[PDB]
């Protein structure tokens, strides 16, 4: 694992890592090859180039509480020159609209968020996939939350 010399990573969340989004490389159909590395939980670029970056996250809950919580998912670039950080891809999601079924009955809600796009990156740039409310993640099943990149 694996032929193709194009730097790649498709990484997946740690379910047994409560309270945060941790990316596991050592699993299933997870990738991490040709110079790409996973380090302070960030994907690290081995070469100047064009890269497709994607991530999906899946939030869940049962019923609605305090008027509003908003879920967000972003991919940041932190750069070797620009020692600072910027969003390449973002998205906010609002599940249950205050509803608060205070009559009764609490239903399952699920809210996925997909981020994808092509960016030019420099050797040693660090990519970061973050969310605001890690405790609303679904850690129960396979292809549900993940973070990938590939050189073109």
């Amino acid at each position, epitope marked *: 694992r694996t032929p193709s010399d194009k730097p790649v990573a498709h990484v997946v969340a740690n*379910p047994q890592a*409560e309270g945060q989004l941790q990316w596991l490389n050592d699993r299933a159909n997870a990738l991490l090859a040709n110079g790409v590395e996973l380090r302070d939980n960030q994907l690290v670029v081995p070469s100047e180039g064009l890269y497709l970056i994607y991530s999906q996250v899946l939030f869940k809950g049962q019923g609605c509480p305090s008027t509003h919580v908003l879920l967000t998912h972003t991919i940041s670039r932190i750069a070797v020159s620009y020692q600072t950080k910027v969003n390449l891809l973002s998205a906010i999601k609002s599940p249950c609209q205050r509803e608060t079924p205070e009559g*009764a009955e609490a239903k*399952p809600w699920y809210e996925p968020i997909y981020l994808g796009g092509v960016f030019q990156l420099e050797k040693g740039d660090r990519l970061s996939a973050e969310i605001n409310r890690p*405790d609303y993640l679904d850690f129960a099943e396979s292809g549900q939350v993940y973070f990938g990149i590939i050189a073109l």
Partner: antibody
Amino acid sequence: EVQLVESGGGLVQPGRSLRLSCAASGFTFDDYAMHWVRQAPGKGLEWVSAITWNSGHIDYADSVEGRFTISRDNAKNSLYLDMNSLRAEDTAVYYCAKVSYLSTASSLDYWGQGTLVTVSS
Amino acid sequence: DIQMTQSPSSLSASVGDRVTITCRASQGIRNYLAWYQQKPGKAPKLLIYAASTLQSGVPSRFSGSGSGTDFTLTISSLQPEDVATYYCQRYNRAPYTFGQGTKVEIKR
């Protein structure tokens, strides 16, 4: 209405093996994850494994993984558990349970009547 | 990991008396907790899911509460048929582990 009919239980020499069955009816079986839950005699309830609607994900217990194999025929509306290399600790009544809402991570909304499996020479 | 711990392990009570069973999780599980009733030899039945939502067709004297780690099954007026063993269950997240159980018994 919803029925989960177990079969496959019985006596078995330790080291040998068994294929439990659970025949579902009264609900579109294809839309639900299923669970196996065992209960050793006098002991309490203990989750065993689970399988999603399309069989794409499977979980087992900090206690098996290598020995048991949950499976599912949707045409036959059936849930299977193939147990291998059996020891006395596997001796228990085994329940199949239909989940409440789709995902494996949902409440066990309906159970079969059980089927006892006695491991003994 | 995860420990589902229900107290007490056993309780006797008077018909009509209100009964309280508690469940503490060793790590938060939001409201991904259900209560199951199991009568002697019978298959267990789901009473509450999402901590507080009664299953349809389940008498309303049964109630639940709690989010996070501490949960409470309550029978507001114990009844002769309520004699059973009750189990809480985690469902987030596998493994879907059950508390050790709580036997319920009566006055007369």
